[PDB]
Paper text:
Histamine-Releasing Factor (HRF), also referred to as Translationally Controlled Tumour Protein (TCTP), p21, p23 and fortilin, is ubiquitously expressed in eukaryotes, and involved in apoptosis, cell cycle progression, cell proliferation and cancer (Bommer and Thiele, 2004, Nagano-Ito and Ichikawa, 2012, Bommer, 2012). HRF can form dimers, and a disulphide-linked dimer was shown to be crucial for the cytokine-like activity of rat HRF. mHRF, hHRF and rat HRF contain two cysteine residues, at positions 28 and 172, and Cys172 is suggested to be the site of the intermolecular disulphide bond. The current model for the activity of HRF in mast cell activation involves cross-linking of FcεRI-bound IgE by dimeric HRF, mediated by interactions between HRF and the Fab regions of IgE.
We report here the first crystal structure of murine HRF (mHRF), solved at 4.0 Å resolution, revealing the conserved HRF fold. The structure of mHRF was solved at 4.0 Å resolution, and contains two molecules in the asymmetric unit. Residues 1–38 and 68–170, and 1–41 and 67–170 were modeled for chains A and B, respectively; similar to other crystal structures of HRF, the mobile loop region (residues Thr39-Val66) was disordered. mHRF contains a C-terminal His-tag, which was also disordered; a substantial region of continuous electron density was observed close to the C-terminus, but the tag could not be modeled with certainty.Fig. 1 mHRF. However, the two molecules of the mHRF asymmetric unit, which are related by non-crystallographic two-fold symmetry, form only non-covalent interactions. The two molecules bury a surface area of 176 Å2 at their interface, in which Glu80-Thr84 from one chain pack against equivalent residues from the other, with a hydrogen bond between Ser82 from each chain. Furthermore, the human and murine proteins are 96% identical, and the residues involved in forming both the disulphide bond and dimer interface are identical.
Numbering used by the authors: 1 to 38, 68 to 170
The structure:
């Protein structure tokens, strides 16, 4: 069994039980799940994901403070990743803020303000949820 954890806040985010697809040229992970009623998202309820909200400036302030934190973790763990990290993120941050009204925010269990903020949206069918994480801010245990 594979468990993907946040590299910063050490919070449980998701596992390999869902469909994992790669997007943004290897920058973000596309975790495909389904709606289960025990009604909620299976990926959210199974990993203690705490929901939060951000404004256009607070998220831009956070994502600038968080993407810098991941770049520092790459400089100590995978220095060759720093170059493709800033390139795809600059295009991705401009893609997230452009579609800011379509994403929902979630944080780790500890609710650390420095942790990862996950995004949630729906496919063209409107009922299949998929979550967007940062691939470089995860540790595979």
């Amino acid at each position: 069994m594979i468990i993907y954890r946040d590299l910063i806040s050490h919070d449980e985010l998701f596992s390999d039980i869902y469909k994992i697809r790669e997007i943004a040229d290897g920058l973000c992970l596309e975790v495909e799940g389904k709606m289960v009623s025990r009604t909620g998202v299976d990926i959210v309820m199974n990993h203690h994901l705490q929901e939060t909200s951000f404004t256009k400036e607070a998220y831009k302030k956070y994502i600038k403070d968080y993407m810098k934190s991941l770049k520092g973790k790459l400089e100590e763990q995978k220095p060759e990743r720093v170059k493709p990290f800033m390139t795809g993120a600059a295009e991705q941050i401009k893609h997230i803020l452009a579609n800011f009204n379509n994403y929902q925010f979630f944080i780790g269990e500890n609710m650390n303000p420095d942790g990862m903020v996950a995004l949630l949206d729906y496919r063209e069918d409107g009922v299949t949820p998929f979550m967007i994480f940062f691939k470089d801010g995860l540790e595979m245990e």
